[PDB]
Design a protein around this ligand. Structure first.
Ligand code: MG
Ligand code: MG
Ligand code: MG
Ligand code: MG
Ligand code: MG
Ligand code: MG
Ligand code: MG
Ligand code: MG
Ligand code: MG
Ligand code: MG
Ligand code: MG
Ligand code: ZN
Lengths: 60, 24, 80, 98, 206, 155, 118, 127
RNA sequence: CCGGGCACUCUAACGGGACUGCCCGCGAAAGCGGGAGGAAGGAGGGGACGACGUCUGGUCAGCAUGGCCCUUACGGCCUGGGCGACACACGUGCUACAAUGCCCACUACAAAGCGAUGCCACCCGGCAACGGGGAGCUAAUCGCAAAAAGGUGGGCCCAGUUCGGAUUGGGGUCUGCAACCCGACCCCAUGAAGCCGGAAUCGCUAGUAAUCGCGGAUCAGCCAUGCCGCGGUGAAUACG
């Protein structure tokens, strides 16, 4: 996203309401997971790399 | 029917509880 | 069916400034921005110009409408 | 009785170091309760393959966290010796409470 | 378009995750960004070395930030004049204080992450793509490998219009898990424009 | 079915008469996949035949069926212009299906409220010799033999 | 009989027949059929000139149904209008009130479609 | 005095114990015709016995847990066929023709993406 | 439920098993047809997996990135509005138009998941949502949970009607600094179009379609009938 809009990490937003994850790396606000603090993209990126332990390619 | 709010299945579907769907 | 609850809300901004105009007797027009702010008896007579998002609309309050909210009287959009 | 809950991300690494914390406790004490598996708690992920539109793709990712027990009989006081802190694996995290 | 990252497609088998440490819960989202910051600045420097893999291990405080390279004698700096300043920058990240026990890589031309780096380096230096390629292929196919392959992106030669240069020899099956093929990506910025370079090196088998 | 002549997937016998025809019928009756109530509906009517016959239920059934199955039905065949309505003998398999399907169909076409009544009174009209069942039947044969002028466009 | 202002349910069940009343629904029934104890499932035809009275007196003078009701509601709307209330508006301009999408599906409030040359 | 044939089905396991008894077949502390109250089929489960002229000349106590009444109706029909042979082996002989001894592999398929359910695929237009 | 015990179910690792290997028929062979054994038979059933390349495909609003353009505004903070407008048009869906159904009471089996400021047992007040009080759990051992359809019983009796819940008036709870614009949920009243859909058109070949309900992600709350998974019952038909 823009740069200003990366102040989310502002401990004092004013009200816990404005607390929006926003991907850590890309900053991708949408598709952001919790268990990873990542957007559906960066997720699948590293996943394929292998920098996320236990995280395998689901099959069943 | 499966969509009438003030009824039995109306809650079962709308996913709720009320005077029309208590517990025990 | 408007659910405020068991603890009404009114953004102080004017609450204080409107409650004070009563001390001098009355005033002459105001102008809120918290159209979200409910309404109380101490309005009757006043004139709180609310924002539409573009302008400051003079909403002449009245007994009948004392229970409503500023916003319902400041029309947002335009059409025909 | 010694509660040992071995939980790792892989069925080998972990499971392996859970056939150790027994031998080193099969002589110095009760023949143990053998290592008990316990079902796995899986965290599943699915994400639109590419970015922008194309929502009819997805690809799937899991995260199986296996479990293990073992459990023994009477803190032999002399078993803790063969065990104590002679570990070695790093892809595990077992907690305790006998 | 068709295809995957055989690496992420082989983790189940022929490939152990970069970071091999159980944990999770209210920590995974943490002990994760950890590595990122690690292998993050960790690349900003060791570029000159052959920074291939960079495993990571944990279990309790005492981490294990390894690092492979083809230029170990570079990591060290001077008996310990470098391998120190850096293990210090570690407390500016992992306050959890960790090692750094380095290791080395045999033949920097089988380490895909590098083979590609090189082809990139070359290219970034205004080199002859298709030539460098047919070379790297050899630098790699010409040392043990059962098969390799290199792929340079577009804007070849600077061409005002994207292209794609191939080249590769010997078996390089990918639809086969039992494969084991180091995959190496290499970015390669340029005066006129970016352009990655992929590196595939099929070795061993079963 | 471009590959092979699909097999006439046999069906399990009836939980009573142990018949297959009967089953098939129950199957046609059932909807939304509720073999239960259907087993009933039909069975419940297998009885109603009695209150109106000293006859046996099964026979009545067999007769209703073996009576509504057609012999020659229409069939299109466009040829260098417009599509003609051609006849032709009828398959021993398309007999059954085309019949049952019509019974359970004509049944649900009646005024009777209690579902089972319908089917029940329907098999009867059927086995007997009239009603919507044999209607749609003797209404197809009549369709062919009305275009029997295309015995040259066989197959 | 003629319970609420001029009523006429008959031949049917009662907990059903009362329904045919304005301020009466499948709810205010059971209540009245209890606050006045009556075997619910009885054909109104088979009603006691004695119960019809308690039933009437209750329902009539216990609520605000029929005629008098139709006027109250209309009164709130008519009121809603008098003041520049948003809601008081959508009513004037035949359009959904409770915050709904007036683009697609809006028929019920708007009625028949007025298809125009697009 | 005792026999045990299993029989699973669509995720339904049935422990089928067989005892020489006169034939008081029953399930989870609930009469057979009482766990399968008005379920046309059910009877099926016993077909195996009914098939070996048994039925009345043999008693059965059975368990079951998992799946749906039906599935159980089937699983049970299996154990009752399994232990039934776990008893007399020369029993398969003509118990196999019908095959009341063959784990019904047919199991619910998965839900693939971009669909509504394995096969049921979204409909479209202007094409 | 406590002692007791791993035989069974299961939980989860590891192997075993099936190869046209066996018998008949045909063939030059591959292999095709049929039969026995067998849990399964000829790729047993479903996934992950998509070749050289094509469409100058999509995305410089994910991220990276060559050039260009603005640097007191094409940057930045904020508050209110907007993304939610409406005379209409199309797409994908949901709920129906009913008696193989709807309603109340009682009663019976699932699988996969989630749970720290979180799942909330049990008791209490309230018609209710929910509020107050409060046990256990870091969770095969406690909670979300009830599965629903189904089964035994009784209600309606073919009616726009006990079908159908749109729309609108009124009262109220929970999240949040704040629900006018613009949230969901409950109780009451309201009870609309709709009685099976023109020309045309979509899906699916077996545990599938059809049908019933359960969880999850995101997330304070929610506009999820959507998306992604689970399992219950369980067909028709394929000449060609
Ligand atoms: Mg940026
Ligand atoms: Mg938020
Ligand atoms: Mg209804
Ligand atoms: Mg999507
Ligand atoms: Mg879609
Ligand atoms: Mg393949
Ligand atoms: Mg283009
Ligand atoms: Mg474009
Ligand atoms: Mg929008
Ligand atoms: Mg009406
Ligand atoms: Mg009708
Ligand atoms: Zn990312």
């Amino acid at each position: 996203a823009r740069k200003a809009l990366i102040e989310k990490a502002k401990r004092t937003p004013k009200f816990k309401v404005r607390a929006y994850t926003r991907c850590v790396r890309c900053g991708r606000a949408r598709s952001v997971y919790r268990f990873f603090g990542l957007c559906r993209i960066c997720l699948r990126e590293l996943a394929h790399k292998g920098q996320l332990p236990g995280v395998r390619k689901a099959s069943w | 029917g499966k969509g009438d709010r003030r009824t039995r299945r109306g809650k079962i579907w709308r996913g709720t509880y009320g005077k029309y769907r208590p517990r025990k | 069916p408007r659910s405020l609850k068991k603890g009404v809300f009114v953004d102080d901004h004017l609450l204080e400034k409107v409650l004070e105009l009563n001390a001098k007797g009355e005033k002459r027009l105001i102008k809120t921005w918290s159209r979200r702010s409910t309404i109380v008896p101490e309005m009757v007579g006043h004139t709180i110009a609310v924002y539409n998002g573009k302008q400051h609309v003079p909403v002449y309050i009245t007994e009948n409408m004392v229970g409503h909210k500023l916003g319902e009287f400041a029309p947002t959009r335009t059409y025909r | 009785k010694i509660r040992i809950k071995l939980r790792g991300f892989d069925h080998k690494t972990l499971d392996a170091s859970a056939q150790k914390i027994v031998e080193a406790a099969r002589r110095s004490g009760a023949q143990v309760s053998g290592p008990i598996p316990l079902p796995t708690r899986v965290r599943r992920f699915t994400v639109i393959r590419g970015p922008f539109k194309h929502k009819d793709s997805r690809e799937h990712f899991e995260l199986r966290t296996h479990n293990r027990l073992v459990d023994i009989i009477n803190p032999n006081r002399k078993t803790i010796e063969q065990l104590m802190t002679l570990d070695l694996p790093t892809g595990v995290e077992i907690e305790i409470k006998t | 378009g068709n295809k995957i990252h055989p690496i992420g497609f082989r983790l189940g088998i022929t490939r152990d995750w970069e970071s091999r440490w159980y944990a999770g819960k209210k920590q995974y989202r943490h002990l994760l960004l950890e590595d990122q910051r690690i292998r993050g600045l960790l690349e900003k420097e060791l570029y000159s070395a052959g920074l291939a893999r960079v495993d990571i291990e944990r279990a309790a405080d005492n981490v294990a930030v390894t690092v492979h390279v083809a230029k170990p004698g570079v990591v060290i700096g001077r008996g310990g004049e470098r391998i120190r300043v850096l293990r210090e920058e570690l407390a500016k990240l992992t306050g959890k204080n960790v090692a750094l026990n380095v290791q080395e890589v045999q033949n920097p031309n089988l380490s895909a992450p590098l083979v590609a780096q090189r082809v990139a380096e070359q290219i970034e230096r205004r080199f002859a793509v298709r030539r460098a390629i047919k070379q790297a292929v050899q630098r790699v196919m010409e040392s043990g490998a059962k098969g390799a392959k290199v792929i340079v992106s577009g804007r070849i030669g600077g061409a005002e219009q994207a292209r794609t240069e191939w080249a590769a020899q010997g078996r390089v099956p990918l639809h086969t898990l039992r494969a084991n093929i180091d995959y190496g990506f290499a970015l390669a910025r340029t005066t006129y424009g970016v352009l990655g370079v992929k590196a595939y090196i099929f070795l061993g088998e079963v | 079915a471009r590959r092979r002549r699909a097999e006439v997937r046999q069906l399990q016998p009836d939980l009573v008469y142990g018949d297959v025809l009967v089953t098939a019928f129950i199957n046609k009756i059932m909807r939304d996949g509720k073999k239960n109530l259907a087993a009933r509906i039909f069975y419940d009517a297998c009885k109603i035949i009695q209150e109106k016959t000293g006859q046996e239920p099964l026979k009545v059934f067999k007769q209703a069926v073996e009576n509504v199955k057609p012999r020659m039905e229409v069939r299109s065949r466009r040829v260098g212009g417009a599509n003609y309505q051609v006849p032709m003998e009828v398959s021993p398999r398309r007999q059954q299906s085309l019949a049952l399907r019509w019974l359970v169909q004509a049944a649900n076409q009646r005024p009777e409220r209690r579902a089972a009544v319908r089917i029940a009174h329907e098999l009867m009209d059927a086995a007997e010799g009239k009603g919507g069942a044999v209607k749609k039947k003797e209404d197809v044969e009549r369709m062919a033999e009305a275009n029997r002028a295309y015995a040259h466009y066989r197959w | 009989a003629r319970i609420a202002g001029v009523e006429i349910p008959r031949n049917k069940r009662v907990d059903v027949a009362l329904t045919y009343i304005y301020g009466i629904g499948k709810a205010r029934a059971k209540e009245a059929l209890e606050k006045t104890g009556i075997n619910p499932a009885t054909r109104v035809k088979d009603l006691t000139e004695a119960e019809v009275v308690r039933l009437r007196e209750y329902v009539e003078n216990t609520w605000k149904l029929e005629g008098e009701l139709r006027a109250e509601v209309a009164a709130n709307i008519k009121r809603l209008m008098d003041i520049g209330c948003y809601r008081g508006l959508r009513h004037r301009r035949g359009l959904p009130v409770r915050g709904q999408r007036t683009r697609t599906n809006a028929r019920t409030r708007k009625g028949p479609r007025k298809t125009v040359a697009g | 005095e005792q026999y045990y044939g299993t029989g699973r089905r669509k995720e339904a396991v049935a422990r089928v114990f067989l005892r020489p008894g006169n034939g008081k077949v029953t399930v989870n502390g609930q009469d057979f015709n009482e766990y399968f109250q008005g379920l046309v089929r059910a009877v099926a489960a016993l077909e195996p016995l009914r098939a070996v002229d048994a039925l009345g000349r043999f008693d059965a106590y059975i368990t079951v847990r998992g799946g749906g009444k039906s599935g159980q109706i089937d699983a049970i029909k299996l154990g009752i066929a399994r232990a039934l042979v776990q008893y007399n082996p020369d029993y398969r002989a003509k118990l196999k023709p019908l095959g009341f001894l063959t784990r019904d592999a047919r199991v619910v398929e998965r839900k693939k993406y971009g669909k509504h359910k394995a096969r049921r695929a979204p409909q479209y237009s202007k094409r």
